[PDB]
Ligand binder design. Structure first.
Ligand SMILES: O=CN(O)CCCP(=O)(O)O
Ligand SMILES: O=CN(O)CCCP(=O)(O)O
Ligand SMILES: [Mg+2]
Ligand SMILES: [Mg+2]
Lengths: 402, 402
């Protein structure tokens, strides 16, 4: 079999993954699961799969330990940064599913990499924030990364085996990769006007909120752009976007003979997770298959970059390097929270992000060696900390009109 | 480099192929070209590429030899069945492009197979008429077959390398192939009624007339169905059809996790031919790439099998085996000629084909061993000869009302 650890097990990615595990008892054993906030769900999961370890936040450690004992469970309870690292570097773990969202997840993904683990990557931060470092660390120690997000996974499925196994192979001209194409639904304001977009908020949210806001601004796709440059070892000019409201075509690889290879699917994350889990093999995933007879019509159009400024910004960030990508993201974080808490207009998200990318204070730190074996991570998190301060300030100043 | 022979070099497939050759002098040398009717074009081609051999029909051998001499050309002139076989089995030929359409091409494709040649298959008859024999012969002697028709080539691109190399691997469950999907444009009477379809003829004809008629009846797709069963080693139930009027999606492979892999392209045959030529490598093909920004909307719907009876018939033929497939095709041939010469209605094509599949006279020969190393080919051509007689009779009887 294969011993698994799911970092961030109480959300969507966790549900989908564990559903497959149930259908495949004989292939995948759970060794560890984690959850920062959702203690009862974490507990429920623990009672079901009997993991050798679990981890939660520092604040919840005591309650969780008390609960774990009140249930008569053999399971070790960890907490915080340290517990994530232990689980990700554990010698009894063969495969890690990195599903923690946010800067708090980097150290464990880096750890899985350090320890040579198979990694099923399911958060954007690992490569948006720690791009060079994650990839360098994986190569050095022989980790394997396999993307789970729908777009990256489609691209990965549509690339020849040699490039799947060694992403730097994409540069040998014989494989004839010309460019990658990311599809994007255009979010909830595709058909609405530039003027209707300056307004809120249940409208903007209609399916998690932040990610749904990112879909409506198109920051999600810029982020995926930055991730793709690292995942598949390209620069941004080689990766283009097409809008595709239906979201049936998950992405495409263009080859130099004119062949576009593409993955089509439903939204069900069990498809990409099953592919990644069983790679190079395939297994039943338990999804309701896409019905080719009921697609009606798949629309495609060019992205309106004036409306979708976050996408231009992200590409601008990708050109500059790890520093501005750190800034792009952290700023988006603060700016999205702001909109959700009704402090800004939807269109200000981009105004704010731009302001931070340009800030003289932020730029002095771009030239730093964020890829460094030894101080890389410190410098990333320091940069993250700095940009929240500035982004927060920026939101303040925007409101008065500065 | 790689020595090539193009059987049937004066049509579309020939043009497209030779265009790629020109862009790639350093990779592909022409050793032979053939052409049954188009003597001057054949000659023009000969004067350009300086082939070591050419072949034409028996009737045109003399004029062509005279012309070849009047041009001061070193080239050997062959003719008929024998000349095709010589070219296809020639030790100086590494790769054969089987582009001859019609029963007259089988012996040379079998010969290429017998001699261990790489074959770029570009006619339907080889597998529709000589399915088991072609595939058995190729395996025994180590020929490699690579389809060039747009649908089969898309499927082939979308199948893992091990199944590309050995089509019987599609049965190991680890590769997780669930089913193949052929796309079909629905031809020129998709939106028109069952009643408007009973009428002709420039309408039915708006590549060639026959193939365009086959598109309008959907016999082309039934034929492709039968070919796919042999190419990819499946039975017909495992291969489904979806109508797709835009013809951007050339076909899809469905995997057990819900992943549909697909090839998108323009109609330009240089795409599939370049893929097949360079396999496993890729090369520039010289096409105007598909423009993802100008697709507007790709429609998909289920095939209307009442209107598209030829498709039901072909699947019925595929169930029975090589005999009924021979009959299906030969009958279609005669029935299409008939329509083109204004002897029948478009809808009678299916009436006629059905009549022949069901004919007691034809059925006695189904149980024959059409796959036999030694008498296989004789029995196929004999069956072809027989079905023209019957189909011709059938057309006669239909007109009076019997
Ligand atoms: O993996 C799926 N997503 O990240 C959701 C994509 C929605 P979008 O195409 O609007 O970015
Ligand atoms: O490869 C190209 N063709 O076979 C033409 C397909 C037209 P159709 O889908 O109507 O059979
Ligand atoms: Mg995504
Ligand atoms: Mg075709």
């Amino acid at each position: 079999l294969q011993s698994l650890a799911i970092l961030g097990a109480t959300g969507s990615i966790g549900d989908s993954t564990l559903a497959i595990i149930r259908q495949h008892p004989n292939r995948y054993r759970i060794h560890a699961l984690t959850g920062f906030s959702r203690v009862d769900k974490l507990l429920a999961l623990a009672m079901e799969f009997h993991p050798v370890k679990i981890c939660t936040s520092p604040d919840n450690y005591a309650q969780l330990s008390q609960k774990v004992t009140d249930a008569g469970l053999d399971t070790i309870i960890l907490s915080g940064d340290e517990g994530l690292i232990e689980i990700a570097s554990d010698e009894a773990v063969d495969t890690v599913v990195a599903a923690i969202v946010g800067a708090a997840g980097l150290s464990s993904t880096l750890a899985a990499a350090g320890a040579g683990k198979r990694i099923l990557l399911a958060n954007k931060e690992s490569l948006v924030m720690a791009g060079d470092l994650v990839i360098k660390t994986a190569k050095k120690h022989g980790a394997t990364i396999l993307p789970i997000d729908s777009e990256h996974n489609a691209i990965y499925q549509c690339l020849p085996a040699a490039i799947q196994a060694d992403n730097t192979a994409i540069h040998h001209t014989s494989y004839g990769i010309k460019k990658l194409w990311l599809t994007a639904s255009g979010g909830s304001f595709l058909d609405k006007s530039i003027k209707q977009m300056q307004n809120a908020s249940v409208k903007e949210a209609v399916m998690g909120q932040k990610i749904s806001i990112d879909s409506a601004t198109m920051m999600n796709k810029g982020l995926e752009l930055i991730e793709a440059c690292h995942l598949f070892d390209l620069k941004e000019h080689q990766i283009q976007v097409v809008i595709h409201p239906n979201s049936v075509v998950h992405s495409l690889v263009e080859y130099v003979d004119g062949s576009f290879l593409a993955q089509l699917g439903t939204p069900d994350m069990k498809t990409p997770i099953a592919h990644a889990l069983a790679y190079p093999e395939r297994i039943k995933s338990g999804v309701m298959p896409l019905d080719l007879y009921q697609l009606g019509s798949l629309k495609f159009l060019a992205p309106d970059l004036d409306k979708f400024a976050c996408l231009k910004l992200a590409r601008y960030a990708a050109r500059l390097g790890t520093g501005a990508c750190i800034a792009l993201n952290t700023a988006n974080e603060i700016a999205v929270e702001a909109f959700l808490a009704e402090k800004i207009c939807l269109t200000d998200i981009a105004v704010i992000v731009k302001a931070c990318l340009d800030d003289k204070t932020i730029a002095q730190d771009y030239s730093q060696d964020f890829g460094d074996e030894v101080l890389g991570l410190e410098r990333i998190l320091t940069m993250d900390k700095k940009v929240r301060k500035i982004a927060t300030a920026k939101i303040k100043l925007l409101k008065q009109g500065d």
